[PDB]
Amino acid sequence: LKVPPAIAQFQKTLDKNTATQVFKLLNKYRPETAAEKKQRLVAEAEAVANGKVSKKPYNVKYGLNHVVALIEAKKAKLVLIASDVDPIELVVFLPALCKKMGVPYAIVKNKARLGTVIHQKTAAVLAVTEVREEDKNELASIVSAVDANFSAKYDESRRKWGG
Amino acid sequence: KKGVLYVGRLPHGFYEKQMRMYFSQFGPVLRLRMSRNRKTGSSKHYAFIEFESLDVANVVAETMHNYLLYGKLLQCKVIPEDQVHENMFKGADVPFKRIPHATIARLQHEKPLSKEKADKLITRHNRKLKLKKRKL
Amino acid sequence: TPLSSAPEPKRRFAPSKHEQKRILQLAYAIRKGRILTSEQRAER
Amino acid sequence: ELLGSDAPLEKVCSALLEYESKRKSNLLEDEQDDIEPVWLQLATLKFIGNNRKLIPYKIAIKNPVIPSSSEACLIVKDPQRVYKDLVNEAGLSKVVTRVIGLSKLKAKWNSYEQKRQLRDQFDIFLADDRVIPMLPRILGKTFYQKSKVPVPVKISKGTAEQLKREVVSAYGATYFNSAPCSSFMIKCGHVSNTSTELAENVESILQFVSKHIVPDGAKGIASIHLKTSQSIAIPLWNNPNLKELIA
Amino acid sequence: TFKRAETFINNYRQRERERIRLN
Amino acid sequence: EQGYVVVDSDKRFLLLFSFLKRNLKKKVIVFMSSCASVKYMAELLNYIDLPVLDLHGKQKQQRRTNTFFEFCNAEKGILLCTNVAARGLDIPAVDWIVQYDPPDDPRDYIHRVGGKSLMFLAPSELGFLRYLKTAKVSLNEFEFPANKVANVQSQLEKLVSKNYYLQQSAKDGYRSYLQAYASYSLKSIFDINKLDLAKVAKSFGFAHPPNVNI
RNA sequence: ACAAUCUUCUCACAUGAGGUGUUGAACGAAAAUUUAAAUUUAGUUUGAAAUCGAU
């Protein structure tokens, strides 16, 4: 059946090769699991108790409201959108906002893969804002790859009434 | 006919034999011409390789084009038949085995010259020095 | 330009006060023996 | 005197300096103290080098060639805080513009553009002797070939006096990397150097070349010529016994 | 099963490194 | 007599930093269009190991007089102040005088000058050069090769995002720069619409413009 | 299985010797050499850029 172009985007997801390369980078900046965060904090509690400067955390940013506001501030370098969100109403505007703010973005396959990155069951969207200087040159590669396999590719197919 | 192809932005270390094997996995290559320096033999990462079948090249190009391999986007573009030439097919599927030119010059320098050869080697060196003096 | 006209707060540049609160009450539980310490955890 | 039982210096240097000055022929925003470098071409009867060596020779000279205003970048082993603290303690802030650890330098900056930017961000590049061999890697032709030969400064002691002496020695010594050839070119200084200073610097370089560079010393040397960046290579000295040595 | 190109380049770089390491 | 350099807005800040680096051992004074800019640049330069005196301090008039007086006896140094900051003050013997932002009183600028003078102008605001023709004031141009201009921009914006107070100074200075530019009189010479906001934001240390209400 | 061993220093007595590893393409100055091509090599450009040129 005929489909609006606002929903037709989510059928033309990211390719197999590039999506793996996104996740390979993301896996370096997974958020700390609640377990070791308890262990990491208790190390500082013990240091405070007996007797006594850190650095900024570097991870991926997740959550629908969190990610939208990072885009609306143009703090997001890369947005990744799960193609099979339960009520599709949740991210049908995200490609529009991500194009409006000039934030490169890609519609990746499955939401459980993104959830595993953030130690959650399901992650509806992820955003990469800050990356350590070691991988700064690496990130610019995928942004070009997304710009080549999602923006150069499709583009016109993003506007056609799907189905 | 032959599937002339000329990929771009080939990642470093993509050996021509390795590239041919990877390409042959998708489809056999009629020509496997690889770029190299005139003397150094250093490849320019130009995969000007002609496939066995023109249609096979198109199918291979569609998958290979814009593939992020080793951090570089595989800009695989099928070379047009008009663009492909006999000189382009010249040197295809051949290794650019470079002899040790640096050692050859060193060996030639180390090569002994007889008294007559040394005089022949000198030749007009005094005249050249006189010519240099005349220029000065 | 962004949309957030509001000025950037102090939280995003200072060490987190969420853990600094959690750290303090963890020192509470360490001092009074409520929770086993890290060195106690290893030997236990 | 040691080269060919004669010292045709000074007068040759003065004549070259006069010729360079004679051959003279907005800029406020493009003003610099750059001067015409003095390049000396030395001819030997045998191959001085057999393989490329990416290590400049610390040819100490009385008159330094590198301007003191040049920013010096030091590459030292981890941790960087210890090396940075010693640099601050020694007061080499105006000399040591930035010190980059070996692990940090190789990892943080890897791209050709980033390496090129870092290469042009420092006028003088210096490397610690502990990790001097790694300089050819993580730099590539963007440094090794683009006129960036790190100075092998010995800073393993981690002493302020040792660092100051090494920094002063590096500033006062010319740089020249040995490569496989029977000939070599050495930068003897700039046009601003005095004729006597240029002659003294040339003699020290020639003495150093015959000592630690030329396998046969003065005997293997065939001819010596000196010139500017565009001047003619006037032959400072030629071996008179080279005819018998060649045979 | 099909083989990805980057798999072979890994082998190529290993061969170059091994020759240097054994040199 | 008036010297001008055709410099783009993005490279405007970078060029001046290089200019101060080359002439560190000379007496230089830079005029900009904002007191907030004066605070920002002075804080920024002193934070990148470039000690610079300024006419802002803690917004204390006594400090401004003391700083101005100290610069008078000092044969070398770099000072920052606005057009109104030096409006009426006696200009001492200074080797280098520079107007960073376009003056809000062009007819007072020509009267004030009447060392050597420098103009920092965008490539899209050359109408001021034609204004000098109508002013019957001689002029000259100074060229600069962009290769030797230091690209510390990679480290600059990174420090701004990392630091808080430095960031707040930049945005307030950026907002004051845009408002002062919007408050200009010679609209046929300096137009806010013609100037590219993205390039201006790059000069302040921002990769992206901050969201300032007009 | 886009994962692998490119050394974060050694030996001899503050001194000597040693560490064998470098993207590609394009632009370009004049030198010393070796038996016309070959070695070194000023000074630059660049998205780890690329569409024949292999000697």
Author numbering:
A (entry chain G): 69 to 120, 125 to 235
B (entry chain o): 103 to 238
C (entry chain m): 213 to 256
D (entry chain K): 5 to 29, 41 to 262
E (entry chain t): 50 to 72
F (entry chain D): 312 to 425, 435 to 534
Which lines from the publication concern this structure?
Eukaryotic ribosome biogenesis is a complex, tightly regulated process that involves many ribosome biogenesis factors and spans different cellular compartments. Here, we answer these questions and reveal how the nascent 60S moves from chromatin to the late-assembly compartment in the nucleolus of Schizosaccharomyces pombe (S. pombe). In vitro, Fkbp39 binds DNA and nucleosomes but dissociates to bind nascent 60S particles and to partition them from chromatin through LLPS. This partitioning provides directionality for the nascent 60S to move into the nucleophosmin-rich GC, where its biogenesis continues.
Among other differences, the RNA domain III is flexible in state 1 but stably incorporated in state 2. The accumulation of state 1 particles in fkbp39Δ cells indicates that Fkbp39 is required for a step in 60S biogenesis along the transition from state 1 to state 2. To gain deeper insight into those biogenesis defects, we characterized state 1 in more detail.
